[PDB]
Swiss-Prot record, chain A:
Modification comment: Acetylated on several lysine residues in the presence of glucose.
Upper taxonomic lineage: Bacteria, Pseudomonadati, Pseudomonadota, Gammaproteobacteria, Enterobacterales
Assembly mode: The RNAP catalytic core consists of 2 alpha, 1 beta, 1 beta' and 1 omega subunit. When a sigma factor is associated with the core the holoenzyme is formed, which can initiate transcription. The rRNA transcription and antitermination complex (rrnTAC) consists of RNAP, NusA, NusB, NusE (rpsJ), NusG, SubB, ribosomal protein S4, DNA and precursor rRNA; S4 is more flexible than other subunits. In pull-down experiments interacts with CedA.
Family to which the UniProt record says this protein belongs: Belongs to the RNA polymerase beta chain family.
Descriptive protein name: DNA-directed RNA polymerase subunit beta
Known role: DNA-dependent RNA polymerase (RNAP) catalyzes the transcription of DNA into RNA using the four ribonucleoside triphosphates as substrates.
Swiss-Prot record, chain B:
Taxonomic source organism: Escherichia coli (strain K12)
Outcome of mutating R762C: Resistant to antibiotics salinamide A and B
UniProt GO BP: bacterial-type flagellum assembly; bacterial-type flagellum-dependent cell motility; cell motility; cellular response to cell envelope stress; DNA-templated transcription initiation; intracellular iron ion homeostasis; nitrate assimilation; regulation of DNA-templated transcription elongation
Binding, Zn(2+) 2: C796, C870, C877, C880
Pfam families from the UniProt entry: RNA_pol_Rpb1_1 (PF04997), RNA_pol_Rpb1_2 (PF00623), RNA_pol_Rpb1_3 (PF04983), RNA_pol_Rpb1_4 (PF05000), RNA_pol_Rpb1_5 (PF04998)
Top EC class for this record: transferase
Record protein name field: DNA-directed RNA polymerase subunit beta'
Presence of keyword Metal-binding: yes
Gene that produces this protein: rpoC
Curated annotation (Swiss-Prot), chain F:
Gene3D superfamilies found in the cross-reference section: DNA mimic ocr
Known outcome of mutating F49D: Partial loss of inhibition of the host exclusion defense system BREX
InterPro entries assigned to the protein according to its UniProt record, in alphabetical order: B-form_Ocr (IPR036207), Ocr (IPR014798)
Subunit relationships: Homodimer. Interacts with HsdM (AC P08957), the M subunit of host type I methyltransferase restriction enzyme M.EcoKI; 1 Ocr dimer binds to M.EcoKI. Interacts with HsdR (AC P08956), the R subunit of host type I bifunctional endonuclease and methyltransferase restriction enzyme R.EcoKI; 2 Ocr dimers binds to R.EcoKI. Interacts with host PglX/BrxX (AC P0DUF9); this interaction inhibits the enzymatic activity of PglX/BrxX through high-affinity binding. Forms a 2:2 tetrameric complex with phage T7 OCR.
Name used for this protein in its record: Protein Ocr
Natural source organism: Escherichia phage T7 (Bacteriophage T7)
Chain coiled-coil ranges: none
Keywords: Early protein, Host-virus interaction, Inhibition of host innate immune response by virus, Restriction-modification system evasion by virus, Viral immunoevasion
SUPFAM superfamilies: B-form DNA mimic Ocr
Length: 49, 1323, 48, 49, 104, 105
């Protein structure tokens, strides 16, 4: 409970939903982000990415 | 209580011992007895003040009715903020004190003074039984470090005459006894004795640090921290929770360790446990002062400390920590942009919801003065209930009051502009349409900020210095200012466009009666070839109007706009189609002729008629407006057939890959150019409706052609992209992909073609995403390098001028001379159109009359009374800048020229697209005789004259006196035209490729012995090569005259590398023969920040003297290659080059002091020390202007020249000086001392001249003061150096008066600053 | 306008009474900066 | 990035003036990464951690 | 090789490690300085003796605890060059820690 | 700054020691060659590092008996330069004696 709740409450991949137009709940569950823990060369941007 | 200078240094401990109070011993908890913490605990009751208006610290005496009473329990008094400078806690604690100025800062004050290594400074703690203090019978060193057993042996063997302490207080026991006036003189005699690499590397600078410390006048015994200073809780942020990521953690740790120390010193504990408590106390104290000290890694949350005691001056290392951070300014707001085009340039709007509370004290004062609201509560009842009286007061105040508007990103000086508010319903401000494009803010949800100036002088400067009616000609650009886009230009293009077959053709009518005829019925606006009445005024005398009338051929809309046109203007600016450039040049002419107020009123009326007739004009695009070219599919089919046949021959085996690539480039370029020409000549002559001629070429009625011909934002590329093909464009380089894309916006695109389109779009957005950090970081350094500039002189009085040689290339001039005439003021040596005479009395302004005077004369370049050279020895003067602002007056003293100059550099570089996309003869374009200047002419036996030099200059007098053709010929070329032969233009004068630079020989005769070898220099399958320097690695000398003669009777015979020379041995050829044919990320950058960092080139050039004879020995030797024949031989000075380019020094290139470019670009260090100052300055300005004309954004030369002048700091003067031996000295401080060396008439006192390149970043982060150059720095390492050196600031810099806050010496208050000159000196 | 309580109060009184004057001295925030610089080992005195 | 063996370019950029290099990296599912890098001296080095 | 080029490569590898690790704290900067001085070492012996022959270095050092006690000369020289590189990269990375935070 | 210069100095000193003494025997080549190798090393501190920096000398040892017992690195580097100079002089002494015998007649 000190690891599951901490990961599900405060993480870069789990943020606040833009819970507005019905399309948003689809495109927020069906998006791909390279930022976060693991698999990120540079945090700001990247030319080869 | 005034103040002049601010000097921070370590004061004497006697004032701290006189202020010794406080009881911070035990950490008792916070109690709720008297709603505050109690005595001798956390927040002890010693250093408190009154938390309310008047009270004691216990519930006791000192009411407000009685003053001057010493408190019973405490020692505080009645008054505030004066007792707090005395009642501070000064308790002795931790006698092994912290010396973090030797730990955190890179020099060591206490370590280098007592000859202590840095490893011993890092190992003061966890110590082993003391250091032996010197005495009578002591044998070892006074700073000798021994172990515990060795110190016990020394204690049992020494006995008498030995006084030492336990901890690290013994060094203080030396420093209390330090009356040293002998060791520093021995160290400086040792420094002047020997000079080698063991004294330069971190010994010379610490020796000079001890020299600056011993001559500052301060005692070293003042460095002893006997007590621990405790700040008052009233001056600290008060917190009654009370501990939430703040000082209280380390506070209770230090008080707990103090309690443990005092308890184990009162209970007589053994040595080991009190040693552990003392080292934990030191670990608390040094972490309380300065965090880290290269250890104690941060854990995270409140179990680890975050804010220390000296962390108040800098908590964050970004931009906002205690150094005058961004304060939330009251009487201000934030507002959302729109546009209302119904007010003048001086008038604007403001929301009702914001403006009801921007003028609360003004409405309160008017209600108190009018006698309706006698009290402030009645004023609140009148304002916050919205009665009609406060609406009338709001209407009275808002009608006449200046209100500033700005943007939250403000990278221009034009961002802050004052306007006049109007009560408009809603809660969104509008922005004036002659202001929107100047802020570089579109209508895409950007947010502006609203400010209210509150004094007499602030309102006067808002109405006199900062608005839109006094910021004209764009000093960031030096180009036209604001002519609108897409609406006003569109309306004035539609109403002034001529067309045949008008309703009621050929009417004779007066001026204003055409508006009488047009408004009712039966008249079109086109109205071509009709002569009507027009009244034109001209000015020939000193502002005198000439009344004239005329009958001129024009249209309806042009003659209606002629009433909008003011009295005196020419007529030829009206007869055109009136595009964007025509309105821009019309605004330029009316600003040049009629002044400022008539051109502001006329631009207002242009705005009025544009946004009033744009609704009458009517723009419309649709399904039929986009003209599809009828010859599109045939061109696409024949281009596809050509590409298919050429790739069939490609896979046949005749074409290589790069040849197919270049053929794809130029064939698809020909294809979409044919599509563009097809849609153009199908777009021109569609309309054939006319009168009396029944067939006439007429401008079509399509909208896209009108917006293309208008030239506001519609270019030809977007025109050929909309109706024609999109084109071929790749993502990484913008290259041309061989896959065919023949799509159109009228048809359906393919999936892969739109995929390549979004390749291009995402690559363009990834290129434009760099503009944030490129613009946010560069202007920081550009303004911070130009901080200390106070213009304070009008009489400059210099003699050395700058030869203004332009970058003229080709027939037509690219960068003209007219922009260099205006602005700066030339020196006393300029000439008339007559020969050999003078034109100025040395004080003459330069604009269009004097520009015509300096255009009609016969001179190539003039000298300019200007910058850097001799500088009047009093500030920067005024003739170097001249006139570049909106006013034509000379920029006088007290104006921040450098702050304008720094923001006027990369104003919109922003890396627009693809990092600005990054012949085989010499064809001329201008006529005139060719005279070889600085060209070593060698007579060839073939009948021609080759060019055996690298410099080529020529002055031309054909129409203007200034030259228009230089054509610098590369070294080793064959000139097809002789010296003094007339050319007609468009003819190749040099039949040699510019990419190849061979070495043409100088003398004929017998070939030097360079006999071949199998595989070393020859390639066999005359054309018999004898020497190849690039293949072997030079083993070549000077050739003989005829057979064996020396070259002493009238500089080395060269051959290029990897070439096959057709001249063999034993051929006896003549002199002048030509040898064989074989000889993007940098340009995409703005190239501004790297010049401020003083970047290093790849290969430096070879420098020599007047004796520049060169020679080479074998291939390689024991030393490096190319042991130099010049320099060494007359003056002993050697150089070592490991590897560079091929040597090109010959007899054609004269070698002197300041040698020409031989092996790549030489670094500007030696170019500034040896060539000159103005040469490096003009070279840097020309390189930055070449980068900017490659980008396509014009900038100012004076701003770049002032930036290069700011790069000229940190020189090393000649060693014949007063306490000066290869020392980095300030250039301004060196040129102040010219008069001291001139009055004494001695070369030993001061140096002659010096100038070094040393970095603009280092000059911007290390200045004369410590308050300035501290934003992008660490505050602690600057304050420790300022405290050891004892350096004051005298409150003169601009950043100093920004951070501190006084009468700033830039602007209108400098005379008030001169009132301070009338206050201190003789006042 | 953004720094001082006494300064904003004096400007409020000058805007109600219609005076529009400047300040007679130091805003005492640079004194807070000097106090935070006195948190180090250096002891700062004032020079006039 | 997937667990396996990657062969990126790494065109000098810190030592050479345009010399190409042929290197390899191994990024597992957990732990440290393996690096088999190139050299103008033509030597194979290992730079784990 | 010279001292300047080796030092430029040293803080180049250091700033590449900072861009790879996104280090903000000074206490985390110091471990990166030690790991970068552990990195970027030359394997040519002539370059190692050329660092010892170039300017900006002295024979005597401050700390003797980092000096090993063995018959290997190259280990003692590598420890001395490692200590000098840690000191120099600290002195010229104290500013680089602010420069990297002010870039992005 | 290079090993070739000090090699040329040792070459010139060995030629002078052959020319002055006129030694025609290969077994009595001890004192002249050892004093030439002892007098060829530089006395400065930076010149030892300059000789060690250039090519022509390595780290691998030929004989471990010539290693002194001291805490100074500069003495070990001087002994290594002395060892390399003795290798070069004792490999070139036979060729220089052949050139000295073929020079005069």
């Amino acid at each position: 409970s000190a690891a599951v709740k901490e990961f599900f409450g405060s993480s870069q991949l789990s943020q606040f939903m833009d819970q507005n137009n019905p399309l948003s709940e689809i495109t927020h569950k069906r998006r791909i982000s390279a930022l976060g823990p693991g698999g990120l060369t540079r945090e700001r941007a990247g030319f080869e990415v | 209580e005034e103040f002049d200078a601010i000097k921070i240094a370590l004061a004497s401990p006697d004032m701290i011992r006189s202020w010794s109070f406080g009881e911070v011993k035990k950490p008792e908890t916070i109690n709720y007895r008297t709603f505050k913490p109690e005595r001798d605990g956390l927040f002890c009751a010693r250093i408190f003040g009154p938390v309310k208006d008047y009270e004691c610290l216990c519930g006791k005496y000192k009411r407000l009715k009685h003053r001057g009473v010493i408190c019973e329990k405490c020692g505080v008094e009645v008054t505030q903020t004066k007792v707090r400078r005395e009642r501070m806690g000064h308790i002795e604690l931790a006698s092994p004190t912290a010396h973090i100025w030797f730990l955190k800062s890179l020099p060591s004050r206490i370590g280098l003074l007592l000859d202590m290594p840095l490893r011993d400074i890092e190992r003061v703690l966890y110590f082993e039984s003391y250091v032996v203090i010197e005495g009578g019978m002591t044998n070892l060193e006074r700073q000798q470090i021994l172990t515990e057993e060795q110190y016990l042996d020394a204690l049992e063997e020494f006995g008498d005459e030995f006084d030492a302490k336990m901890g690290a207080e013994a060094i203080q026991a030396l420093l209390k006894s330090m009356d040293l006036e002998q060791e520093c003189e021995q160290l400086r005699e040792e420094l002047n004795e020997t000079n080698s690499e063991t004294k330069r590397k971190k010994l010379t600078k610490r020796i000079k640090l001890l020299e600056a410390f011993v001559q500052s006048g301060n005692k070293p015994e003042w460095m002893i921290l006997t007590v621990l200073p405790v700040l008052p809780p009233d001056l600290r942020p008060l917190v009654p929770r009370f501990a939430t990521s703040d000082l209280n953690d380390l506070y209770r740790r230090v008080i707990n360790r103090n309690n443990r120390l005092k308890r184990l010193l009162d209970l007589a504990a053994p040595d080991i446990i009190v040693r552990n408590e003392k080292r934990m106390l030191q670990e608390a104290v040094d972490a309380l002062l300065d965090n880290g000290r290269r250890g104690r890694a941060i854990t995270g949350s409140n179990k680890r400390p975050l804010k220390s005691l000296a962390d108040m001056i800098k908590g964050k290392q970004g931009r906002f920590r205690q150094n005058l951070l961004g304060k939330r300014v009251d009487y201000s707001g934030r507002s959302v942009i729109t546009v209302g085009p119904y007010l003048r340039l001086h008038q604007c709007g403001l929301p009702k919801k914001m403006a009801l509370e921007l003028f609360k004290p003004f409405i309160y004062g008017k209600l108190e003065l009018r006698g309706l609201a006698t009290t402030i509560k009645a004023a609140k009842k009148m304002v916050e209930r919205e009665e009609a009286v406060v609406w009338d007061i709001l209407d009275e105040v808002i009608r006449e009051h200046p209100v500033l508007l700005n943007r939250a990103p403000t990278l221009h000086r034009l961002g802050i502009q004052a306007f006049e508010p109007v009560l408009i319903e809603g809660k969104a401000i509008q922005l004036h349409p002659l202001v929107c494009a100047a802020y570089n803010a579109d209508f895409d949800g950007d947010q502006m900020a609203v400010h209210v100036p509150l004094t007499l002088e602030a309102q006067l400067e808002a109405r006199a210095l900062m608005m839109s009616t006094n910021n004209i000609l764009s000093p960031a650009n030096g180009e036209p200012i604001i002519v609108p886009s897409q609406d006003v230009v569109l309306g004035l293009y539609y109403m002034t466009r001529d067309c045949v077959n008008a309703k009621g053709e050929g009417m004779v009518l007066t001026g204003p009666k055409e508006a009488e005829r047009l408004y009712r019925s039966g008249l079109a606006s086109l109205h071509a070839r009709v002569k009507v009445r027009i009244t034109e005024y001209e000015k020939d005398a000193n502002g005198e109007l000439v009344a004239k009338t005329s009958l001129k051929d024009t249209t309806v809309g042009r003659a209606i706009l002629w009433m909008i046109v003011p009295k005196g203007l020419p007529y030829s600016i009206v007869n055109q189609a009136l595009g964007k450039k025509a309105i821009s040049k019309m605004l330029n002419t009316c600003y040049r002729i009629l002044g400022l107020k008539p051109t502001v009123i006329f631009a207002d009326q242009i705005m009025y008629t544009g946004f009033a007739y744009a609704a009458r004009s009517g723009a419309s695009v649709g399904i039929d407006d986009m003209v599809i070219p009828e010859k599109k599919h045939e061109i696409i089919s024949e281009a596809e057939a050509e590409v298919a046949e050429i790739q069939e021959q490609f896979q046949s085996g005749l074409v290589t890959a790069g040849e197919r690539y270049n053929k794809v480039i130029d064939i698809w370029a020909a294809a979409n150019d044919r599509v563009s020409k097809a849609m153009m000549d199908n777009l021109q002559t569609e309309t054939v409706i006319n009168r009396d001629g029944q067939e006439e070429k007429q401008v079509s009625f399509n909208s896209i052609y009108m917006m293309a011909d208008s030239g506001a934002r519609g270019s030809a590329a977007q025109i050929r992209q909309l109706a024609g093909m999109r084109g071929l464009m790749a993502k990484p380089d913008g290259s041309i992909i061989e896959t065919p894309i023949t799509a159109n916006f009228r048809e359906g695109l393919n999936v892969l073609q739109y995929f390549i389109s979004t390749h291009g779009a995402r690559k363009g957005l990834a290129d434009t995403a760099l503009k944030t950090a490129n613009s946010g970081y560069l202007t920081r350094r550009l303004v911070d390098v130009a901080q200390d500039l106070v213009v304070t002189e009008d009489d400059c009085g210099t003699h050395e001028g700058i030869m203004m040689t332009p970058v003229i290339e080709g027939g037509d001039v690219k960068e003209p001379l007219r922009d260099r005439v205006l602005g700066r003021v030339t020196a006393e040596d300029v000439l008339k159109p007559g020969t050999a005479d003078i034109l100025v009395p040395r004080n003459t302004l330069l604009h269009e009359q004097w520009c015509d005077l300096l255009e009609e004369n016969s001179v190539d370049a003039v000298k300019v009374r200007s910058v850097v050279s001799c500088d009047t020895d009093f500030g920067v003067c005024a003739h170097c800048y001249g006139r570049d602002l909106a006013r034509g007056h000379i920029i006088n003293k007290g104006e921040a020229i450098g702050v304008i100059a720094a923001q006027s550099i990369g104003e919109p570089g922003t890396q627009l697209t693809m990092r600005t996309f990054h012949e085989s003869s010499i064809q001329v374009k201008n006529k005139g005789s060719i005279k070889l200047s600085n060209v070593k002419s060698v007579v060839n036996s073939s009948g021609k004259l080759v060019i055996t030099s690298r410099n080529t200059e020529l002055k031309l007098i054909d129409e203007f006196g200034r030259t228009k053709e230089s054509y610098k010929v590369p070294y080793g070329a064959v000139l097809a035209k002789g010296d003094g032969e007339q050319v007609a233009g468009g003819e190749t004068v040099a039949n040699w490729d510019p990419h190849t630079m061979p070495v043409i020989t100088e003398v004929s005769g017998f070939v030097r012995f360079t006999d071949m070898i199998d595989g070393q220099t020859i390639t066999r399958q005359s054309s018999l090569v004898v020497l190849d320097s690039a293949e072997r690695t030079r083993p070549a000398l000077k050739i003989v005259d005829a057979q064996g003669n020396d070259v002493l009777i009238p500089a080395q015979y060269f051959l290029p590398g990897k070439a096959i020379v057709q001249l063999e041995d034993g051929v006896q050829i003549s002199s002048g023969d030509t040898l064989a044919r074989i000889p993007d990320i940098t340009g995409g950058l703005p190239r501004v920040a790297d010049l401020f960092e003083a970047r290093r080139p790849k290969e430096p050039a070879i420098l020599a003297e007047i004796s520049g004879i060169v020679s080479f020995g074998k291939e390689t030797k024991g030393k490096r290659r190319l042991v130099i024949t010049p320099v060494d031989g007359s003056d002993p000075y050697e150089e070592m080059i490991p590897k560079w380019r091929q040597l090109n020094v010959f007899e054609g290139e004269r070698v002197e002091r300041g040698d020409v470019i031989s092996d790549g670009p030489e670094a500007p260090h030696d170019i500034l020390r040896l060539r000159g100052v103005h040469a490096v300055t003009r070279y840097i300005v020309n390189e930055v202007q070449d980068v900017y004309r490659l980008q396509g954004v014009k900038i100012n030369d004076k701003h770049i020249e002032v930036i290069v002048r700011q790069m000229l700091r940190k020189a090393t003067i000649v060693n014949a000086g007063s306490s000066d031996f290869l020392e980095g000295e300030q250039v301004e401080y060196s040129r102040v001392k010219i008069a001291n060396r001139e009055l004494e008439a001695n070369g030993k006192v001061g140096a002659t001249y010096s100038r070094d390149l040393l970095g603009i970043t280092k000059a911007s982060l290390a200045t004369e003061s410590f308050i300035s150059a501290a934003s992008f720095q660490e505050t602690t390492r600057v304050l420790t150096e300022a405290a050891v050196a004892g350096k004051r600031d005298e409150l003169r810099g601009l950043k100093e008066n920004v951070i501190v806050g006084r009468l700033i010496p830039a602007g209108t208050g400098y005379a008030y600053h001169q009132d301070r000159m009338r206050r201190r000196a003789a006042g | 306008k953004s720094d001082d309580v006494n300064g904003r109060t004096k400007m409020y009184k000058n805007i109600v009474d219609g005076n529009h004057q400047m300040e007679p001295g130091m805003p005492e925030s640079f004194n807070v900066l000097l106090k935070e610089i006195r948190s180090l080992g250096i002891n700062i005195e004032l020079e006039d | 990035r997937s667990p396996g063996v990657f062969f990126d370019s790494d065109k000098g950029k810190t030592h050479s003036s345009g010399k190409v290099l042929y290197n390899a990296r191994i990024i597992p599912y957990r732990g440290s990464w393996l690096d088999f890098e190139f050299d103008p001296k033509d030597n194979l080095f290992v730079r784990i951690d | 090789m010279t001292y300047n080029n080796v030092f430029d490569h040293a803080y180049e590898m250091l700033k590449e490690n900072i861009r790879y690790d996104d280090i903000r704290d000074t206490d985390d900067l110091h471990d990166a300085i030690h790991m970068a001085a552990d990195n970027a070492v030359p394997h040519y012996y002539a370059d190692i003796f050329s660092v010892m022959a170039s300017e900006g270095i002295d024979l005597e050092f401050e700390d003797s605890g980092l000096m090993p006690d063995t018959k290997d000369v190259i280990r003692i020289l590598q420890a001395r060059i490692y200590e000098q590189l840690t000191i120099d990269l600290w002195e010229d990375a104290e500013d680089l820690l602010n420069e990297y935070l002010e870039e992005v």
